[PDB]
Amino acid sequence: DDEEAEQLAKEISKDWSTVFERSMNTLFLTEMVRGLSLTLKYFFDPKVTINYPFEKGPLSPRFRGEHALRRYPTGEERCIACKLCEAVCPAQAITIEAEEREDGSRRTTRYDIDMTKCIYCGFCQEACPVDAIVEGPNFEFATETHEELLYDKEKLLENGDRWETEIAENLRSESLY
């Protein structure tokens, strides 16, 4: 059948000044010179590139990057140890141990998110009742050694105080959703 299919698909283009049109396209590349022309148009157009360290790609306040334990404006870690994020975590990155502090109000003696064992899905930010754990738009925390990448119990996730100026902004703009 392929023999007859070939015979007919070549008897479709079989009238002079059509065999010539197709011959010219093969003889002088026409489809290919339309490839080169487009490629040239893009060789001369402005470049969609970004010299990274100096300017960075667009993000959104919902962007999920480095996890940060938030604080209440008046100190006092926002993280009451409900363990909802430890429960909701799909990868079980967060290990929370709780102890009634001397003040009497519950708090987490151990709040260690394992960033390497963490999927950055933002479930912890949703599950936390008081917005205690949020993902700071950092996303730039590549560490030379794996042990540093395991974020310690409430000490490095407490560096969100530096990122609060941006985390509070993102929360004030996302809370409408």
Binding site: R34, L38, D45, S60, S173
Partner: protein, 38 residues
């Protein structure tokens, strides 16, 4: 002489796009949770 029939003039470089950056609350969204009857 190419794929430019006054329609590629919609070019990729936008230069005016996301004019209101996302975390800037010009309008406060509402996002209804439940239907009013419920």
């Amino acid at each position: 002489p190419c794929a430019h029939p006054e329609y590629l003039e919609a070019v990729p470089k936008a230069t005016e796009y996301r004019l209101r950056c996302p975390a800037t609350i010009d309008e406060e969204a509402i996002v209804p949770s439940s239907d009013p009857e419920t």
